[PDB]
Design a protein around this nucleic acid. Structure first.
Ligand SMILES: [Zn+2]
Ligand SMILES: [Zn+2]
Ligand SMILES: [Zn+2]
Ligand SMILES: [Zn+2]
Lengths: 1284, 724
RNA sequence: UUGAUGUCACGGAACCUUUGUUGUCUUCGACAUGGG
């Protein structure tokens, strides 16, 4: 007869479960089955279907109970209720019928032989083993444990999620194999229930030993335990159909990522950016004339998606759908994942292992440590879900979306840090008797708790790219993305150590001290700063389980494992960690970085630019910081980008047997980069965190516009605003942060030299930070380093200079112009180019500083010869009086601008100066027209005295009729428009068109937009002309950088200003109508002989005097306020600016013609800024010094070499054009500045003779003489030809 | 370069010819691949001429690759790193397409070869096979089975499938299913396409005795690059025909020409050939095993006169076991056993660690790490010391040589052997071969070792029990007919026997009369017989004590006629061994490195000193110096893993510098009795007798109550070396 | 839905490797219209 005991297990952590196996494979030869015996099992309800439920075997519970009983007997010296136990018996014949054999050593408490195998009076431990009693009858029986009520589920994936578990090589830092298990969350499935049944002859002492062993058992199935006695699918295909119908599926990827970004809040849908001028015509969201904007805003108002959890799920699914569609729009040439990431390896136990017995003794104590782990940087515990594929790298979350800090990762980093303390790796073999080394014995005592955050907002996405070292652009198809958890999250931390020494081992005291000091590097992606924690609020206590009174109190309370017990235990933990005896310094040093930038800064984020209300086309990266439940944004400079900059600075200046390190593949590689920065075969030894700005700056918008080289007007390019952080000489941006460097690197002088040289060149300003360095952003003024003990910064002393020779005098010009005071000239003329354009197929590569080529800086002063306008277009209502409060109703109004200022400092953007100098350099070298509206189609009025060709011409006619600003072959009306058969690109010589241009032939090139060789139809057969080689293209980074210009003196204004007490603001001048250029004037007709004339330049003259008097230049009547005029704040002549140009890998003839284009000659000047034709904008530039990089440590003065460079530039021009060099003298004759008594008028004609009180001809009369269609191009291409 | 090619394929191409179509398609593919790879070709900045015509023909082409990737990696005039890169590119370009709904055969067949060949190239990482390799072979099989499902006798897919299956067998996996069926189809295919196939027809012959193919194997032409393998295959074919004289001739010809690198599969196939002849109970295996052993003696000397290094090979131990069993002469058995001793075996991971340290010291042993040529020997697929006479032992001694034969043990026999040499007997009676079973002795050692690691002196009872197992396993140690009564014994152990106190073996006897071995004979130890090189002692008065051991004050050593340094640094250690002291005492801690013995180190005051550092010291003058060691010698040795493990330690480093004789402990020694013991030996510098006097003095205290705790303190000390 | 004299699986960090970069002057004068 028997009696029964009810049992239940309560799990405190996610427990592990093994895969189902067919009944034949459930045998000792199947490695996957044997390795899973310690886990929970899945019961298929019926063989051929996954429907089932989990369960735990009683055989597993018995094995744990026996292990507990051995431990309790050794503490009590083998006596239970003052009755004695023998060692037990653990060996059988016919070992082959056992599925598993004991690897571990059995404990001993006595030396006596065990009971005979056919006796009657067995001791209590032999009753628990079932040798007492020994169809089959059980003396104590353990049943299986099941979920209460035996519910069923359709499969394991309903219960839990399968997860990859690593094994990392200590020496390499890389994992070479892994295994998998299902993790089942305890909050969903806390309890399992079962029963134990006992025969009535079992002794009372055996019953006590059983109950104590159950209470002492603290783990099962890999978890700590206590034992007690649809819309997203519809919306996707809807959007896909809309995006296809409108023929804009090139944006599917961007839409997918931008919509997925809306997980953060439904309130973002109301804030999506609008078009310029503020209309709902944005190029993404207003596709569909319903718009995607309407589809999302109606999804947002839907009650089924008003719950934040359901909005998140909606966005995730819709993003996945759009992404899975988006791939088909491209060739799909490669799989992006890399090779054999599939090596599942299961440890094999050794059947042949030898039996052993060990004493351990009665001394046994348990130390509890409690605290928190606080994320000091973003962190990444990688867990990919194969059912989600939009993100390449994904982070581990609980089923209810709280962030998780796994048990498995905490153990893995303890074992790593213990091997670091002892400075001795383990060969971490699987199987066989336990490893007896000093680290493994500590880990065998340790216990840690799986933990989760309370914070549960969705992760951030960070995008990453790869740079093509030769071209300086992104590599083809290199974009990839990653999820990260925010910094500031707090996890509960609890560790327990059970062992024989008093308190913790000294190695563990030290490792916990490293964690408390802030060096708990715990997550993946460490090389880019992820996963650094500090252990905080630590408290500890030791329990003496050898004491019978404390042991029984420990058993009574289940060791205070559950939450009720734990709060009672935390009342009597001592504060602070114990100090170690043999303290050892940690393996990583913190190096502190300080960077100063006197220029704007941008580190772009395209997805944010799409979602953000601000609407500018490029915006800075911002990162979110968790504090409590809130997430707050911060502007930062990414760890990834900063790592990339420093890595390339080292790479470009080192070699591996004559090959630059930028040119290697770095696979199976052991070079200097791989030794420091790591490889795909080993971890790196330097870790970069994010840098952040102090004083909390705010973005500012800058607008830009491309200028057509023919017409001089805007080129209607795709809008390209940016929103950098503002910095200037009076208000530098201060970047601060740290990177961590391993101790064995600082101890190596060969690595300190490599880093020292690279950081020296960053400090020299050769490596700007972020984007748009071409126009003056990201200029580093200094880089400071602390914490190296001067082992790195000893190489970073400033290079200073070599010599103090002065710059030569610029030559006097030989240009001449015969002005006649009675005559009138035209405001602009065209330079007609030479027929030959010198092109090269393969430019200079960016991957190293080439020998025989120059790298350095030019410093310049700019001086105004004529009043200058450079407007601050951020506010076009500047001069409205304050008393006219808040007049704004979408009326239209007279616009008014201030001069450009940044932090209240008067400046000129570098984008202006680059374009101004580029235009002259393009002309001096006879380059192509870099900017040109080659797909424009001209038209003319008819004189009063079907093929798809006819359709495109007619629809051109229809639009020009509709969009006429002056309104009150197939033709709809008897006298009408004539539309050109050809694009305007066909009216220009094919060698003068842009090297990388638009498609201008017949047939739609969009047929090929999925295939990569399309780009070859758009490129010239012979390569890049000189200007595109120097200033660059969208496929090739340029070699010159232009900085902002700063005013030197206190301002001198054109008009004295409204407040006499303030010298820093000027008064308004009101301008005449600035109006569109007209190519129909200079290309007079449809005839093929009318080709494009040349490059427009505006002449120098003093009509600005008439305008400050308030009179119109042509007809001297007063200028009148209207919504078509502008008012502006203008600087006077005599103001002086300074600015700097950086250059890299130039030839001597390139630098010669660049200095020539800046400097020109005495008697010549440039045109800068607004209102050129009205006289404004004349400036002169003088070179102040040239400084050259010899190497990383030596810079030298280049002033003495300028005469040589100029000579070689002119020699190059003679080599190309062989004195057929007229286009230069025509240029210089338009750059000529009038001298002394000379005063050309200069102005446009009036529309009619009688409209002009001066009586000059006017256009209607001028077209009938001296500017007839046959003569007009010759007039306009001859500088200073008079029209009256 | 590539853009110009595309232009040519458009000047001359019409698509009613498939050669024009193919040559155009190839040019576009090679263009677009290196656009992804970011080569220098990305600086080619030009475009296509004749824009409207080029647009027309390209759009026609797209309105209307395995052929390329087949061609790459046919070139193999390049290193193993370069082979690895090209194979991986083939995989990551073709893996994307082979998973299509119905992929082409040549796409599948090319990718299968890339996975197979890439699998061969994986560098080992431990005692197990790398998991990446086994996965790669299973991937290769998977793609072949797509081709073989649609065509049951595609010869190339069949041969790739079989090649991968054989490698799985080499890795220790089981054969796949249908292995016999696929091998039968190969026997129906019926011809040797490459020499790499002949092993399949031999597998078929062995499984089915269908001898028809053996004539082809013998008839094959000899003008081949890897003839040593061909002779082994001819030898196997010639065995199945029962032509045993030519089996002998081909077998010896194969071994004589054998490759120098164990990574070549020849060495594994040779051992299986020997083991196959044995299990068929031929007599040829004995001769071939002995010849193979004689060839396997290939090694490196490190600095230090007596220390050697070798690369790891998994079946070397099996070959030496076979050669030992083949040889009948006891004197020649000893030379086989002696060949294993005092030699480290490292993997290509740790060989690189030594290469770095040699570089750090700017030492030309760095060039001896051309042994990493072994990495370029993985692929057969391409088809690419003085012997010390035993007569030098002085006649008043006895020498005992141990060998532990694991194969003979696991086959159930008595695999432990003690080869005893007596120099006084007639020339045919000098050698005895006494055999014993060490399984229970090994278990009792591991049982002591764990109790020692957890409790130190608490393990004394397990030590006492272990010392009785030495006698129970070796009763002949207490027989006068094997070890005559008075003569000193020289021990040359093997494996875990190095860890045992052989000099302290206990005979139980009558319950009142326990007897210990050191009461009968004096003892000395040598790691191996080839270290035997006697010399006189140093002719100096200097005695030096180097200490970094703050736990204790050696009041009897430090207050005497000694040059005492209480703290010490590696520079002082280096300096002292350049003065050739009469006696040198070194009392400090040390730590082991389980993975790489040479990186085990001594703990000096501010800087650790490795075994590598100690061996490589320049200008050392230490010949004939007597040396005594503290805890470092015991602590620089890891816990044992296998019965035949042997681990280098500081005692072996000093002996490489020709030190006279060395006193050290087998386990951690009590400082208070180090203080007494070493003082006595310093005062009376005849170590061999004075250590026995000390042990026989203390054994009187042991006999009073048989305290194991006292036996634990006096047993560990032993003498290593053999001076004149 | 376990099988019993033998389960160190708290025996195993999803780890390692990749600059959102590149190219663009916030510029500016000749018409409009259909008849007869
Ligand atoms: Zn019992
Ligand atoms: Zn270990
Ligand atoms: Zn490298
Ligand atoms: Zn160009």
């Amino acid at each position: 007869m028997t009696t029964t005991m009810k049992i239940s297990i309560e799990f405190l952590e996610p427990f592990r479960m093994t895969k189902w196996q067919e009944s034949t494979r459930r045998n000792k030869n199947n490695k996957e089955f044997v390795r899973g015996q310690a886990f929970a099992r899945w019961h298929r309800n019926k063989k051929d279907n996954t429907k089932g439920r989990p369960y735990i075997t009683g055989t597993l519970l018995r094995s744990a109970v026996i292990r507990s009983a051995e431990n309790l007997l050794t503490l009590s010296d083998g006596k239970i209720s003052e009755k004695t136990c023998c060692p037990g018996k653990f060996d059988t014949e016919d070992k082959d019928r056992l599925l598993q054999l004991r690897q571990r050593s059995t404990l001993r408490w006595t030396d006596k032989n065990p009971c005979p195998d056919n006796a009657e009076t067995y001791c209590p431990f032999c009753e628990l083993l079932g040798r007492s009693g020994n169809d089959w009858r059980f003396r104590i029986h353990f049943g299986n444990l099941s979920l209460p009520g035996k519910p069923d589920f359709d499969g394991p994936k309903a219960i839990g999620s399968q997860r990859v578990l690593n094994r990392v090589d200590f020496k390499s830092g890389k994992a070479h194999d892994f295994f998998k298990a299902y993790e089942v969350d305890h909050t969903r499935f806390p309890r399992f229930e079962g029963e134990i049944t006992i025969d009535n002859k079992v002794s009372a002492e055996a019953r006590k030993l059983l109950c104590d062993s159950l209470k002492f058992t603290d783990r099962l199935c890999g978890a700590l335990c206590v034992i007690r006695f649809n819309l997203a699918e519809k919306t996707a295909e809807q959007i896909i159909s809309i995006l296809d119908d409108n023929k804009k599926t090139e944006y599917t990827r961007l839409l997918a990522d931008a919509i997925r970004s809306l997980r953060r809040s439904s309130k973002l849908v109301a804030g999506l950016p609008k078009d310029h001028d503020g209309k709902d015509d944005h190029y993404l969201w207003d596709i569909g004339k319903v718009t995607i904007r309407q589809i999302l805003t109606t999804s947002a108002d839907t009650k089924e998606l008003k719950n934040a959890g359901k909005w998140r799920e909606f966005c995730e699914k819709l993003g996945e759908a759009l992404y899975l569609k988006s791939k088909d729009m491209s060739g799909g040439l490669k799989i992006t994942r890399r090779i054999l990431g599939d090596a599942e390896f299961h440890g094999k136990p050794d059947r042949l292992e030898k039996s052993r017995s060990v004493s351990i003794g009665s001394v046994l104590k348990e130390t509890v440590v409690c605290g928190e782990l606080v994320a000091k940087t973003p962190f990444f515990f990688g867990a990919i879900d194969e059912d989600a594929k939009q993100t390449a790298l994904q982070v581990l979350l609980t089923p209810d979306n709280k962030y998780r800090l796994p048990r498995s990762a905490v153990r893995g980093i303890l074992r790593r840090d213990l091997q670091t303390y002892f400075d001795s790796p383990c060969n971490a073999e699987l199987g066989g008797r336990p490893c007896m080394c000093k680290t493994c014995r500590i880990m065998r005592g340790i216990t840690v708790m799986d933990a989760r955050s309370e914070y549960n907002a969705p992760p951030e996405i960070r995008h990453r790219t790869r740079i093509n070292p030769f071209t300086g652009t992104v590599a083809e198809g290199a974009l990839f993305n990653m999820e990260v958890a925010p910094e500031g999250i707090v996890f509960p931390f609890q560790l327990r150590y059970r062992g024989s020494e008093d308190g913790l081992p000294d190695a563990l005291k030290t490792v916990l001290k490293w964690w408390a000091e802030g060096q708990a590097f715990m997550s993946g992606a460490a090389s880019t700063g992820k996963g650094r924690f500090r252990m905080e609020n630590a408290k500890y206590e030791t329990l003496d389980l050898s004491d019978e009174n404390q042991r029984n109190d420990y058993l009574k309370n289940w060791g205070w494992r559950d939450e009720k017990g734990l709060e009672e235990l935390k009342k009597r933990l001592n504060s602070g960690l114990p100090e170690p005896g043999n303290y050892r310094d940690p393996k990583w040093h913190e190096i502190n970085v300080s960077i100063e930038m006197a220029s704007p800064f941008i580190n772009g984020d395209p997805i944010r630019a799409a979602v953000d209300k601000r609407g500018t086309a490029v915006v800075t990266f911002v990162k979110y910081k968790a504090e409590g439940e809130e997430a707050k944004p911060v502007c930062a400079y990414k760890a990834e980008s900063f790592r990339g900059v420093i890595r390339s600075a080292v790479a470009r200046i080192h070699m591996e047997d004559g090959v630059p390190l930028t040119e290697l593949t770095h696979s199976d590689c052991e070079c200097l980069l791989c030794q420091i920065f790591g490889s795909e075969y080993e971890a790196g030894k330097i870790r970069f965190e994010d840098l952040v700005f102090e004083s909390d700056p705010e973005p500012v918008t800058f607008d830009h516009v491309a200028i057509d080289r023919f017409t001089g007007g805007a080129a209607d390019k795709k809008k390209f605003d940016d929103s950098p952080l503002p910095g200037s000489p009076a208000r530098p941006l201060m970047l601060k942060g740290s990177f961590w460097i391993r101790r064995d690197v600082l101890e190596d002088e060969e690595y300190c030299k490599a880093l020292g040289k690279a950081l020296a060149d960053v400090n020299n300003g050769l490596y700007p930070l972020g984007g748009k360095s071409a126009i003056g952003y990201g200029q580093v003024k200094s880089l400071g380093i602390k914490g190296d003990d001067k082992r790195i910064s000893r190489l970073m002393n400033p290079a200073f200079d070599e010599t103090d020779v002065a710059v030569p005098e610029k030559p006097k010009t030989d240009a001449e112009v015969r002005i006649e005071a009675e005559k009138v000239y035209y405001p602009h003329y065209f330079v007609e180019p030479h027929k030959k354009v010198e092109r090269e197929e393969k430019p200079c590569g960016h991957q190293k500083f080439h020998e025989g080529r120059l790298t350095g800086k030019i410093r310049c002063k700019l001086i105004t010869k004529t009043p200058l306008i450079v407007p601050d277009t951020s506010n076009d209502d500047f001069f409205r009086p304050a008393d006219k409060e808040a007049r704004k109703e979408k009326d239209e109004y007279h616009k008014s601008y201030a001069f450009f200022r940044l932090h209240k400092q008067i400046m000129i953007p570098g984008s202006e100066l680059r374009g101004m100098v580029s235009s002259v350099y393009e002309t001096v070298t006879n380059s192509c027209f870099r900017i040109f509206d080659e797909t424009k189609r001209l038209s003319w009025r008819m004189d009063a005295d079907i093929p798809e060709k006819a359709r495109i011409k007619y629809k051109e006619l229809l639009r020009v009729y509709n969009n006429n600003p002056q309104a009150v072959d197939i033709v709809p009306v008897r006298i009408s428009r004539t539309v050109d058969d050809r694009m305007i690109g066909k009216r220009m010589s094919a060698d003068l068109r842009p090297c990388h241009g638009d498609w201008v032939e017949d047939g739609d090139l969009s047929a090929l937009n999925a295939y990569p060789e399309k780009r070859l139809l758009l490129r010239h057969p012979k390569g890049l002309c000189p200007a595109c080689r120097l200033f660059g293209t969208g496929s090739y980074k340029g070699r010159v950088r232009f900085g902002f210009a700063s005013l030197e003196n206190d301002p001198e204004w054109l008009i004295p200003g409204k407040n006499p007490g303030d010298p820093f603001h000027g008064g308004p001048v009101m301008l005449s109508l600035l109006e569109r250029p007209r190519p129909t004037w200079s290309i007079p007709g449809s005839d093929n002989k009318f080709k494009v004339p040349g490059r427009k330049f505006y002449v120098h003259h003093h009509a600005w005097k008439t305008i400050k008097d308030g009179n119109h230049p042509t007809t001297g009547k007063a200028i009148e306020q209207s919504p078509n005029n502008r008012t502006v704040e203008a600087l006077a002549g005599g103001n002086s600016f300074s600015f700097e140009i950086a250059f890299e890998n130039l030839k001597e003839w390139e630098l010669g013609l660049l200095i020539h284009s800046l400097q020109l000659e005495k008697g010549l000047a440039h045109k800068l800024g607004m209102a050129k034709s009205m006289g404004f904008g004349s400036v002169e530039i003088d070179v102040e010094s040239v400084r050259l990089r010899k190497d990383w440590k030596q810079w030298r003065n280049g002033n003495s070499e300028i005469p040589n460079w100029l000579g070689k530039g002119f020699a190059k021009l003679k080599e190309w054009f062989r004195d057929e060099l007229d286009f230069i003298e025509n240029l210089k004759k338009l750059l000529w500045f009038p001298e002394g008594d000379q005063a050309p008028r200069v102005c446009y004609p009036m529309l009619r003779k009688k409209d002009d009180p001066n009586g000059n001809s006017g256009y209607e009369e001028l077209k009938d003489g001296e500017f007839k269609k046959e003569d007009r191009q010759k007039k306009l291409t001859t500088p200073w030809t008079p029209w009256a | 370069n590539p853009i110009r090619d595309i232009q040519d394929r458009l000047k001359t191409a019409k698509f009613d010819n498939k050669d024009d179509m193919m040559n155009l398609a190839s040019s576009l593919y090679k263009y677009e691949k290196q656009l992804m790879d970011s080569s220098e070709a990305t600086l080619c900045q030009q475009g296509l001429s004749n824009r409207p015509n080029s647009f027309s023909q390209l759009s026609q082409f797209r309105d209307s690759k395995f052929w390329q990737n087949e061609y790459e990696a046919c070139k193999n005039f390049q290193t193993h790193k370069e082979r690895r890169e090209t194979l991986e590119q083939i995989i990551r370009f073709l893996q994307n397409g082979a998973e299509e709904k119905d992929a082409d055969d040549l796409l599948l067949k090319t990718l299968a070869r890339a996975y197979f060949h890439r699998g061969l190239l994986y560098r080992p990482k431990g005692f197990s096979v790398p998991a990446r390799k086994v996965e790669a072979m299973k991937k290769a099989i998977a793609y072949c089975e797509i081709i073989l499902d649609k065509n049951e006798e595609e010869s190339e897919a069949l041969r790739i499938w079989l090649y991968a299956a054989m490698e799985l067998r080499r890795c220790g996996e089981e054969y796949p299913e249908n292995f016999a069926e696929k091998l039968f189809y190969l026997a129906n295919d019926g011809f040797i396409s490459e020499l790499y196939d002949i092993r399949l027809f031999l597998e078929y012959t062995e499984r089915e005795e269908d001898n028809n193919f053996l004539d082809m194997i013998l008839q094959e032409n000899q003008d081949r690059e890897r003839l040593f393998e061909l002779c082994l295959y001819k030898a196997r074919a010639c065995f199945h025909l029962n032509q045993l004289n030519d089996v002998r001739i081909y077998g010896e010809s194969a071994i004589d020409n054998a490759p120098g690198a164990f990574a070549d599969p020849f060495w594994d196939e040779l051992v299986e050939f020997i083991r196959m002849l044995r299990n068929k109970k031929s007599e040829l295996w004995k001769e071939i095993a002995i010849k193979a052993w004689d060839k396997c003696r290939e090694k490196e000397m490190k600095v230090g006169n007596n220390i050697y290094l070798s690369w790891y090979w998994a079946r070397q131990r099996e070959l030496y076991d076979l050669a030992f069993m083949a040889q009948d002469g006891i004197e020649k058995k000893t030379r086989i056993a002696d060949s294993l001793k005092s030699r480290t075996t490292l993997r290509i991971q740790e060989l690189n660690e030594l290469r770095k340290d040699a570089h750090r010291k700017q030492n030309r042993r760095l060039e001896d790490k051309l042994d990493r040529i072994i990495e370029q020997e993985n692929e057969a697929r391409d088809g690419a010391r003085e012997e010390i006479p035993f007569a030098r032992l002085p006649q008043n001694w006895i020498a005992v040589h141990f060998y532990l034969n694991e194969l003979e043990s696991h086959e159930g026999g008595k695999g432990g052997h003690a080869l005893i040499y007596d120099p006084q007997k007639a020339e045919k009676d000098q050698w005895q071969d006494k055999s014993f079973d060490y399984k229970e002795l090994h278990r009792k050692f591991l049982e002591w070792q764990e109790n020692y690691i957890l409790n130190e002196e608490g393990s004394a009872d397990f030590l006492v029990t272990l010392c009785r197992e030495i006698e129970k396993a070796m009763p002949f140690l207490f027989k006068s007919e094997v070890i005559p009564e008075d003569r000193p014994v020289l021990w040359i152990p093997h494996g875990f026997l190095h860890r045992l106190p052989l000099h302290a073996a206990m005979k139980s006897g009558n319950n009142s009369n326990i007897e210990i071995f050191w009461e009968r004979h004096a003892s000395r130890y040598l790691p191996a017989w080839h270290l035997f090189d006697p010399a006189p002692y140093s002719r100096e008065e200097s005695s030096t004590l180097l200490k970094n051991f703050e736990e204790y004050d050696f009041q009897n050593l430090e207050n005497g006629e000694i040059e005492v340094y209480a703290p010490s640094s590696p520079k002082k250690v280096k300096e002292a061994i350049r003065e050739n002291p009469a006696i040198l005492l070194l009392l400090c801690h040390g730590e082991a490195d389980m993975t790489n013995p040479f990186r085990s180190c001594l703990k000096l005051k501010n800087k650790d000193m490795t075994i590598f550092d100690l061996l490589t010291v320049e200008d050392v003058r230490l010949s004939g110096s007597r040396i005594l060691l503290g805890a470092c010698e015991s602590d620089m040795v890891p816990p044992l893993e296998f019965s035949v493990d042997e681990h280098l330690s500081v005692s072996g480093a000093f002996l490489s510098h020709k030190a006279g004789e060395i006193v050290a402990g087998l386990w951690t020694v009590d400082s208070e009795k180090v203080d007494e013991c070493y003082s006595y030996l310093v005062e009376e510098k005849d170590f061999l007798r004075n250590l026995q006097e000390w042990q026989m003095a203390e054994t009187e205290n042991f006999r009073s109550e048989n305290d194991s705790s006292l036996f634990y303190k006096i047993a560990p000390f032993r003498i290593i070396g053999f001076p004149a």
